[PDB]
Design a protein around this ligand. Structure first.
Ligand SMILES: CCCCCCCCCCCCCCCCCC(=O)OC[C@H](CO[C@@H]1O[C@H](CO[C@H]2O[C@H](CO)[C@H](O)[C@H](O)[C@H]2O)[C@H](O)[C@H](O)[C@H]1O)OC(=O)CCCCCCCCCCCCCCCCC
Ligand code: CLA
Ligand code: CLA
Ligand code: CLA
Ligand code: CLA
Ligand code: CLA
Ligand SMILES: CC(C)=CCC/C(C)=C/CC/C(C)=C/CC/C(C)=C/CC/C(C)=C/CC/C(C)=C/CC/C(C)=C/CC/C(C)=C/CC/C(C)=C/CC1=CC(=O)C(C)=C(C)C1=O
Ligand code: HEC
Ligand SMILES: CC1=C(/C=C/C(C)=C/C=C/C(C)=C/C=C/C=C(C)/C=C/C=C(C)/C=C/C2=C(C)CCCC2(C)C)C(C)(C)CCC1
Ligand SMILES: CC1=C(/C=C/C(C)=C/C=C/C(C)=C/C=C/C=C(C)/C=C/C=C(C)/C=C/C2=C(C)CCCC2(C)C)C(C)(C)CCC1
Ligand SMILES: CC1=C(/C=C/C(C)=C/C=C/C(C)=C/C=C/C=C(C)/C=C/C=C(C)/C=C/C2=C(C)CCCC2(C)C)C(C)(C)CCC1
Ligand SMILES: CCCCCCCS[C@@H]1O[C@H](CO)[C@@H](O)[C@H](O)[C@H]1O
Ligand code: OEX
Ligand SMILES: [Ca+2]
Ligand SMILES: [Cl-]
Lengths: 38, 341, 79, 334, 137, 455
């Protein structure tokens, strides 16, 4: 059970970092019109 | 240039309220149906037929007023004002429930008249009569619930009463006596109604959000003209959005709107068919295999057996006041109850 | 072909006419109740006419063709 | 050109057959977890002690259910609102007895469905669309939150969350009516107006457009073939439809602005379901439907029943029978 | 059916003398009962001890009898267990315990008479509904 | 002369009347008036509602029987109440109401002045009060001023608790009392440990705070974090990562705050529903969990007095009829209220031992005030109808009661939900307007037409 718990904690943290750093990576610019929004 | 053709001329004039030949039937019957409900909910009791107050005059509010069904002893009497029961006496007629058959029957012919109006206007304007075809579903619901269902039962008493809380009671009666939520025909109706609400919301939202920028104002409603040839929103951008969000999307505008007709109309028609069965108590009440196993195995329990217990409670606790002509006397000791409650 | 409502209900002639008829109907409906005439037209029990003084039976119609006479009987039993 | 920038371009690419996006990075794993667990549990999970009284209810097909009676059973009333992941159990067998799968399934589902709503915003931005389709979807989403999360929070236990099954849903509805008189609650009444009205307006719009299609086909072929995907011209005569609908009622009850019409179609059901979801979410805190029981009494003080008292009789039969072994004291306070 | 003086005539004491309340005294009692008692005694039962109700027959067999005005007024002043054996003002509202049950403070003797008359008139009107519980709703 | 002469129409602004307040986005002077007049409305309501509540207040009824939500807020702060939450002096309630009501005239005055008399824009009149939404330095500067006001407001609570009478402590020895807080909690491991606590049952995140020392010390930290953050934001300007991450416009700033307020309203909904420390049950009524535990206690008491051995009475299912074990072993009340064993309250904790409820304490030490308290709370459970008929849905008319906790939880869940809808609406619009396509797809440059086919 302790191995399962660590596995899920690591997997959940991985995906949340992707979500956060994805939206930090210049997301307003990722549109098909005005690509300069800072 | 006979009187018939002149009368036809006048009926079909373009006025604020189109009349048509259909109006001869529609307008009196619809007016009398609505007027009877308003008269009855305002002034008329249900004391001699149901043991209930049902009017503003007695102290009811909008949620509890009703025109209630006649007494069980009336059978399926037409209950004409000049009939053998009321014998011309307007006051007795009201006390015996004659306003129920009055609203039911004038409402039915009013509904026929509205559909004929749809055909009549479609024929003059030159459009296909699908609006009227779609309207067969409301009529099927009304005819099966308010007419066919009581005709199969002992009397009009068990039809729905025309009231807000009275219809709520009808819902709960159908759960407890008929186990109507288990009926596959009701389930198909639920899917049609909810799928229609879904379609209505998704199509309206898709159009409003794939609009073309045909104006400069921040209010996009002004950038549309009824006689423009171009579509006001992008079907191509709508198809790519839904194909990528959901996996599939509409690509044919005509199929999309035919499907918006098809889904709720078919659902209401399916529910009408189940209610015809219930007119005969031809219920989807049980699963026989579940009952055989539960009878023999007191540890077998499912959400199915759990719901039967609640129906059994509904029946025993509501029947005496709900069916007063039966004179049910259920001593406390026979009432089914769980622990403590 | 018909005249717009917005001109009718902003016109003086409309308000002259309807400042009379509207209160006359509202007052007449008021007296329909307060004179008690509503109870006798429709047959609705007044608060003291649901039950005789000591009974708790409901006066329920139990016969199709004698229903008129049954209701009259029950009204008589209000002494 | 570096690895992270190529990944960001793939994630947000408008060329993938199914759009992923940053919401999809959360959505895809959680919906997969919820889906696989649900399918396995619906087929093979052993009975669950829903109400905490060592009286397990059978929900799965292998343990004697059909499609209609089967469910994933909510977790035990002994667990309440406690968080019960697999690793908090001494064993899978313990976890199954107490309804663990239900919690794993709904939590992953609610997460995944919230991201589904974000994903609808996100792709609409990548495509140059206007943004508010996700707003329409917030109405069913908030409804799922109400029956799976908010109502348990207000009642103190996930054992009073809606079961994941057909007949379980009916049990939820019946018990809800007994304990809150939801039928007499104006927010459920607005919800009925939304879904009834949405189905009406759905058929109405479908039948009008369909009945004003412009003749582009012979009678031996589907009229659908008279429309080509992407064509610039409108495929039906809206002025003809307005001329019909106006004469059907009166002229000024009929839209002729297509943008007002479709906004009305979006608005009516979305607003009604918002109130349906708010009915469930506020009845979670026991502000219940109207109570007119014994509201009408006569000159002596006899109770004169109305239709509201008949409803109350039915409610009582549900109240006394539900969870028949779970109450020790006279009031079912939660 | 009307609320008549016969209806409003209730036992004054155990000896058998009777008092006749006024229509307004009954309605005042109903209001004070709601204000002070209904939270536990709605409809004639007792939510914190359902074995004891406020039926006239139950009150008749209390010790001392409580099926008359003076017995009820005394109960509201100095409540006892059903067998007379124990005083319970510390857990039941009374003038004697109006310091811990503050809603009793503003009550006067004539208020108690109103509450008592309501408790004795209501089963004459409602029958088994009074003290009957949910079975009779 | 002309109806369209002013800039207050669609023709001039692009916005229809039903979005009329969007015409103010770039009129900083009128926009200031809109805000200040609205602040007057808030202050007006707080004042007039208190006087209504006081005018309708009968002090020997419990507050929660009288439909009060503001007087309980004032009483909680230590004004007007003594031991056990008895009302000893209604005059502080009167003062709060009056002072709010008078001040609302000041705010309405300035609001109406700035809205319909003063400069319509502020940027020519003053470089200080004027602003451009795209000016990130000015925006963080105004944000910094307001952080400072908020920290001062947090510290006013600390000052009332530590130096101006104290707070009402439902947990205070002897049935609860007003108490001065002399040792507020300052250890960050306690204060920020609340933040990292699970929100599920038995833990409850920050809704679990159960003593005034943690409350007071929590606002000492919040006040300092706020004054330090306001200073940071006056003296700095957003970094590049922040600049590249956000949409910088007036509608976007609004949407961020809508999301913030939505979350806070959901948190308040649970606070009032679960917490009985900063929402004392004396004032607000028992919580749902509380009323349910109190029924079990009520009947354990009744039946033990009749001679039942409550510790060994086996219930119909095999679980203890009065007492059972929680999943981790604690002795707890039996029945459906097994779900509510996380409940804690001053009237129940004396019977609690290391293993949970103590059978010896249950047999010997139950005082009459506990019996009284459990009976009162069980009969005032947070259940009632919309027309204020108290009790379960099947109850008859008689008792006119809906718990304040239900009124406060439902209202604030409804508001929190619509404010999340508002967040999604304005957030989506701010993004589409910044990128340039909030009015529709440009027909000549439709992006989808330049994309490869999916299949
Ligand atoms: C942007 C990013 C924001 C963050 C998002 C990340 C997601 C994290 C997960 C959040 C979801 C939590 C789910 C469980 C919530 C819950 O069980 O809530 C309960 C908790 C309170 O916990 C309770 O707290 C209690 C604390 O009281 C204790 O202490 C008290 C002190 O007086 C008393 O003594 C009391 O008796 C005693 O028991 C007990 O511990 C209870 O057992 C415990 O259940 O609320 C709380 O944590 C307060 C916070 C929860 C708010 C709930 C919001 C619901 C959101 C739905 C929105 C719908 C949207 C639809 C979109 C369309
Ligand atoms: C115009 C549309 C319309 C329609 C379709 C109806 C229909 C109905 N009404 Mg309603 N009603 C209407 C208008 C209408 N009404 C109006 C305007 C009023 C206000 C006065 C009413 C007031 C009213 C009351 C008070 C009642 C009804 C009732 C009814 C029901 C029974 C009718 C009946 O049995 O008559 C039968 C009569 C006919 C069919 C007449 C046709 C006879 C033809 C013309 C003879 C043909 C003979 C042939 C040409 C030549 C033979 C000659 C020979 C000697 C050689 C039926 C549902 C009853 C009801 O609802 O009970 C519940 C009832 O009590 N109606
Ligand atoms: C809190 C609610 C609130 C507030 C504070 C405002 C404020 C404002 N609105 Mg908005 N608005 C609102 C709700 C509100 N609105 C609602 C509900 C709608 C939909 C109906 C609108 C639709 C709308 C439109 C279409 C427009 C505005 C405009 C405005 C601005 C100019 C108004 C003006 O010049 O009128 C002048 C009005 C008068 C001269 C009549 C009397 C007005 C005074 C203020 C009444 C105050 C009475 C009060 C008792 C006095 C107290 C005095 C006391 C302190 C001594 C102003 C800042 C306008 C704008 O944006 O300008 C660019 C504009 O075009 N609003
Ligand atoms: C935080 C908000 C809040 C809360 C929790 C309460 C709670 C309470 N109030 Mg107070 N009050 C409030 C705000 C609030 N009020 C406001 C804004 C006013 C000024 C009108 C008042 C003026 C007031 C008076 C004069 C009285 C109360 C009273 C009460 C008590 C009885 C309530 C009742 O019976 O309502 C009945 C319930 C309703 C009327 C609800 C109707 C449904 C609403 C309107 C739907 C709202 C929908 C949503 C907001 C809009 C969505 C639009 C959509 C298109 C997006 C209860 C404790 C009474 C009391 O007991 O005093 C001691 C009393 O006499 N209140
Ligand atoms: C908080 C919102 C706010 C803001 C940003 C402004 C800003 C402005 N006002 Mg407005 N105004 C406001 C509220 C506000 N006012 C209120 C509440 C009233 C009613 C009293 C007015 C009535 C008013 C008039 C009649 C005039 C202005 C004017 C001005 C301009 C010059 C003011 C100045 O330099 O004073 C200098 C600074 C001071 C005098 C400092 C005073 C500090 C006060 C007295 C106490 C502060 C303590 C604390 C922060 C207050 C807490 C209150 C809160 C708890 C409710 C400036 C744009 C002038 C203008 O329009 O120029 C053309 C002008 O003639 N205001
Ligand atoms: C209303 C209050 C408020 C607002 C609107 C802002 C707004 C801003 N701050 Mg400021 N700040 C504030 C108060 C505020 N601050 C206070 C009180 C302090 C003192 C501590 C600071 C100290 C501060 C610093 C040191 C910095 C900022 C910065 C900024 C800018 C970047 C924001 C950002 O990226 O957040 C988004 C948050 C993140 C990207 C971090 C990850 C957040 C995680 C994932 C969320 C987890 C929360 C969880 C779900 C729920 C809470 C419980 C949890 C604690 C367990 C933005 C303009 C940055 C800046 O540009 O300064 C000029 C910056 O460097 N602020
Ligand atoms: C392991 C095991 C066994 C698991 C089993 C678990 C289990 C419980 C299974 C349940 C079984 C189950 C499915 C039961 C349901 C049975 C049921 C009640 C069936 C009803 C069947 C029936 C005949 C009903 C009659 C009424 C009827 C026809 C209903 C149809 C409902 C329906 C399909 C509605 C459509 C809803 C829907 C999602 C539409 C999407 C349309 C769409 C892509 C729009 C997008 C879009 C919009 C635009 O606006 C534009 C412009 C474009 C371009 C565009 O694209
Ligand atoms: C809950 C906090 C109560 C309140 C409020 C009122 N009563 Fe009560 N009542 C309660 C209990 C638990 C009991 C039984 C106590 C015992 O151990 O015997 C009672 C009993 C009575 C009786 C006796 C009934 C009988 O059949 O003997 C009477 C007459 C009575 N109570 C009257 C009464 C009045 C008038 C109240 C409002 C002023 C009132 N009670 C409030 C619980 C509670
Ligand atoms: C029966 C009968 C008859 C008939 C009668 C009639 C025809 C009647 C009518 C009647 C009517 C015709 C009535 C009416 C009424 C109405 C009313 C009573 C109304 C009310 C309303 C209201 C109250 C409103 C409200 C509202 C809403 C709804 C929404 C909006 C807002 C408001 C709030 C305004 C005859 C003789 C033939 C024969 C015998 C029998
Ligand atoms: C802008 C605008 C608007 C709004 C406005 C507003 C919002 C305003 C506000 C205002 C306000 C906010 C006001 C206030 C006022 C107040 C006052 C005026 C007060 C007074 C007081 C008094 C007088 C008192 C008295 C007393 C005392 C002292 C004691 C006790 C008793 C008594 C009560 C008697 C609108 C929307 C309309 C529209 C247009 C625009
Ligand atoms: C007073 C008090 C206290 C304390 C408190 C505290 C200390 C608090 C704090 C709090 C806090 C400390 C909070 C925080 C929060 C945070 C947040 C809320 C965040 C958010 C974030 C966001 C929203 C982001 C987003 C994003 C992403 C993720 C990506 C990129 C893009 C963006 C940016 C959008 C206590 C309880 C002890 C007790 C009572 C009293
Ligand atoms: C039913 C009535 C059907 C039409 S009947 C028809 O009506 C004509 C006038 O329009 C007459 O000239 C003709 O002789 C007559 O038979
Ligand atoms: O668990 Mn499901 O259901 Ca809501 O009340 Mn209580 O708990 Mn149970 O009883 Mn009724
Ligand atoms: Ca202009
Ligand atoms: Cl229980």
């Amino acid at each position: 059970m302790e191995t399962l718990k660590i596995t899920v904690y690591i997997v959940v943290t991985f995906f949340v970092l992707l979500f956060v750093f994805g939206f930090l990576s210049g997301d307003p610019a990722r549109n098909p019109k005005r690509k300069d929004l800072e | 240039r006979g009187w018939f053709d002149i009368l036809d001329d006048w009926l079909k004039r373009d006025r604020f309220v189109f009349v048509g030949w259909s109006g001869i039937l529609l307008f009196p019957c619809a007016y009398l149906a609505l007027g009877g409900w308003l008269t009855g909910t305002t002034f008329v009791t249900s004391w001699y037929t149901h043991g209930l107050a049902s009017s503003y005059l007695e102290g009811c509010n909008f949620l509890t007023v009703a025109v209630s069904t006649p007494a069980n002893s009336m059978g399926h009497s037409l209950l004409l004002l000049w009939g053998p029961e009321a014998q011309g006496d307007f006051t007795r007629w009201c006390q015996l429930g004659g306003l129920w058959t009055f609203i039911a029957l004038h409402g039915a012919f009013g509904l026929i008249g509205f559909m004929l109006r749809q055909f009549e206007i479609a024929r003059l304007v030159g459009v296909r009569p699908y609006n009227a075809i779609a309207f067969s579903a409301p009529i099927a619901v009304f005819v099966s619930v308010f007419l066919i269902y009581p005709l199969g039962q002992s009397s009009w008493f068990f039809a729905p009463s025309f009231g807000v809380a009275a219809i709520f009671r009808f819902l709960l009666f159908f759960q407890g006596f008929h186990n109507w939520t288990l009926n596959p025909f009701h389930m198909m109706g639920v899917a049609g109604v909810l799928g229609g609400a879904l379609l209505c919301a998704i199509h309206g939202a898709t159009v409003e959000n794939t609009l073309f920028q045909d104006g400069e104002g921040a209010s996009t409603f002004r950038a549309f003209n009824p006689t423009q040839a171009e579509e006001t929103y992008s079907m191509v951008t709508a198809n790519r959005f839904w194909s990528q969000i959901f996996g599939i999307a509409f690509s044919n505008k005509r199929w999309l709107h035919f499907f918006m007709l098809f889904v709720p109309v078919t659902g209401l028609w399916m529910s009408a068919i189940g209610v015809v069965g219930l007119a005969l108590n031809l219920r989807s009440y049980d699963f026989i295999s579940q009952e055989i196993r539960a009878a023999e195995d007191p540890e077998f329990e499912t959400f199915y057996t759990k719901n039967l217990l609640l129906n059994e409670g509904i029946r025993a606790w509501m029947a005496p006041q709900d069916q007063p002509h039966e004179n049910f006397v259920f001593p406390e000791e026979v009432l089914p109850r769980g622990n403590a409650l | 072909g018909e005249r717009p409502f917005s001109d009718i209900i902003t016109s003086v002639r409309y308000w002259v006419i309807h400042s009379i008829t509207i209160p006359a109907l509202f007052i007449a409906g008021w007296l329909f109740v307060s004179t008690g005439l509503a109870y006798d037209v429709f047959g609705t029990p007044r608060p003291d006419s649901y039950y005789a003084q000591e009974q708790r039976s409901i006066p329920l119609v139990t016969d199709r063709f004698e229903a008129k006479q049954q209701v009259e009987t029950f009204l008589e039993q209000l002494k | 050109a570096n690895l992270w920038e190529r990944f960001c371009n793939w994630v947000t690419s408008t060329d993938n057959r199914l759009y992923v996006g940053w919401f999809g990075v959360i959505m895809i794993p959680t919906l997969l977890a919820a889906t696989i667990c649900f399918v396995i549990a619906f087929i093979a999970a052993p009975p669950v002690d829903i109400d905490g009284i060592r009286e397990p209810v059978s929900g799965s097909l292998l343990y004697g259910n059909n499609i209609i009676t089967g469910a994933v059973v909510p977790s035990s009333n002994a667990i309440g609102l406690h968080f019960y992941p697999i690793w908090e159990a001494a064993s899978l067998d313990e976890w199954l007895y107490n309804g663990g799968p239900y919690q794993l399934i709904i939590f992953h589902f609610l997460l995944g469905a919230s991201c589904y709503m974000g994903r609808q915003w996100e792709l609409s931005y990548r495509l140059g669309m206007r943004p508010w389709i996700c707003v329409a979807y917030s109405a069913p989403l908030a409804s799922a939150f109400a029956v799976f999360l908010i109502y348990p929070i207000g009642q103190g236990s996930f054992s009073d969350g809606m079961p994941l099954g057909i007949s379980g849903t009916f049990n939820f509805m019946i018990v809800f009516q007994a304990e809150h008189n939801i039928l007499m609650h104006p927010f459920h009444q607005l919800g009925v107006a939304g879904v009834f009205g949405g189905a009406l307006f759905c058929a109405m719009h479908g039948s009008l457009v369909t009945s004003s299609l412009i003749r582009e086909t012979t009678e031996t072929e589907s009229a659908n073939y008279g429309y080509k995907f992407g064509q610039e011209e409108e495929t039906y005569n809206i002025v003809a439809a307005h001329g019909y609908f106006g004469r059907l009622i009166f002229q000024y009850a009929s839209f002729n602005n297509s943008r007002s019409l479709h906004f009305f179609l979006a608005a009516w059901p979305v607003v009604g379901v918002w109130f349906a979801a708010l009915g469930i979410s506020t009845m979670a805190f026991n502000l219940n439907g109207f109570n007119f029981n014994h509201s009408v009494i006569d000159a002596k003080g006899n109770v004169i029943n109305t239709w509201a008292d008949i409803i109350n009789r039915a409610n009582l039969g549900m109240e006394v029978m539900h969870e028949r072994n779970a109450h020790n004291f006279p009031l079912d306070l939660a | 059916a009307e609320l008549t003086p016969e209806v409003l005539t209730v036992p004054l004491n155990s000896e058998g003398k009777t008092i006749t309340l006024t229509e307004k005294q009954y309605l005042e009692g109903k209001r004070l009962f709601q204000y002070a008692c209904a939270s536990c005694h709605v409809g004639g039962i007792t939510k914190t001890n359902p074995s004891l109700d406020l039926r006239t027959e139950t009150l008749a067999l209390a010790t001392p009898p409580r099926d008359n005005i003076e017995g009820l007024v005394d109960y509201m002043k100095n409540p006892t267990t059903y067998d007379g054996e124990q005083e319970i003002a510390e857990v039941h509202p009374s003038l004697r315990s109006a310091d811990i049950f503050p809603k009793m403070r503003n009550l006067t003797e004539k208020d108690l008479v109103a509450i008592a008359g309501h408790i004795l008139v209501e089963p004459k009107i409602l029958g088994d509904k009074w003290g009957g519980g949910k079975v009779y709703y | 002369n002309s109806i369209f002469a002013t800039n207050r129409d669609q023709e001039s602004s692009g916005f229809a009347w039903w979005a009329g307040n969007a015409r103010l986005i770039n009129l900083s002077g009128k926009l200031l008036g809109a805000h200040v007049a609205h602040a007057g409305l808030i202050v007006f309501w707080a004042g007039a509602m208190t006087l209504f509540e006081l005018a309708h207040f009968i002090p020997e009824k419990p507050m929660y029987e009288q439909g009060l939500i503001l007087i309980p807020h004032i009483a909680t702060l230590g004004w007007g109440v003594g031991p056990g939450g008895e009302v000893v002096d209604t005059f502080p309630f009167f003062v709060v109401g009056v002072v709010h009501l008078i001040s609302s005239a000041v705010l309405g005055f300035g609001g109406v002045y700035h809205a319909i008399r003063g400069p319509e824009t502020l940027e020519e009149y003053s470089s200080f009060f004027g602003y451009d939404w795209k000016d990130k330095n000015k925006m963080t500067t105004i944000l910094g001023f307001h952080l400072i006001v908020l920290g001062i407001g947090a510290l006013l609570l600390v000052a009332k608790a530590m130096f101006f009478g104290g707070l009402y402590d439902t947990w205070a020895p002897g049935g609860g009392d007003v108490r001065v807080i002399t040792n507020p909690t300052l250890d960050p491991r306690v204060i920020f440990g609340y933040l990292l606590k699970s929100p599920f049952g038995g833990e409850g995140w920050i809704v679990s705070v159960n003593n005034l020392e943690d409350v007071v010390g929590g606002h000492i930290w919040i006040g300092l974090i706020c004054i330090a953050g306001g200073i940071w934001h006056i003296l700095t300007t957003p970094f590049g990562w922040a600049r590249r991450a956000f949409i910088w416009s007036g509608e976007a700033y609004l949407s961020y705050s809508l999301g913030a307020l939505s979350m806070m309203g959901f948190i308040a909904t649970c606070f009032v529903w679960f917490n009985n420390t900063v929402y004392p049950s004396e004032f607000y009524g028992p919580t749902g969990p509380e009323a349910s535990q109190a029924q079990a206690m009520t009947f354990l008491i009744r039946d033990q007095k009749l001679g039942a051995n409550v510790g060994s009475a086996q219930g119909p299912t095999g679980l203890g009829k009065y007492l059972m074990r929680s999943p981790t072993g604690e002795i707890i009340f039996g029945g459906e209220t097994m779900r509510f064993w996380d409940f804690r309250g001053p009237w129940l904790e004396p019977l609690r031992g290391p293993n949970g409820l103590d059978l010896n304490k249950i047999k010997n030490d139950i005082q009459p005030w506990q019996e009284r308290r459990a009976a009162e709370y069980m009969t005032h459970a947070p259940l009632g109808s919309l027309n204020s008929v108290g009790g379960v849905a099947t109850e008859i008319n008689s008792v006119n009661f809906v718990s304040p906790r239900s009124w406060l939880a439902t209202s604030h869940f409804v508001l929190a939900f619509f404010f999340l809808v508002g967040h999604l609406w304005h957030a989506g619009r701010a993004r589409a307007a910044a990128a340039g396509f909030e009015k529709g797809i440009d027909r000549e440059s439709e992006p989808v037409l330049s994309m490869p086919s999916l299949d």
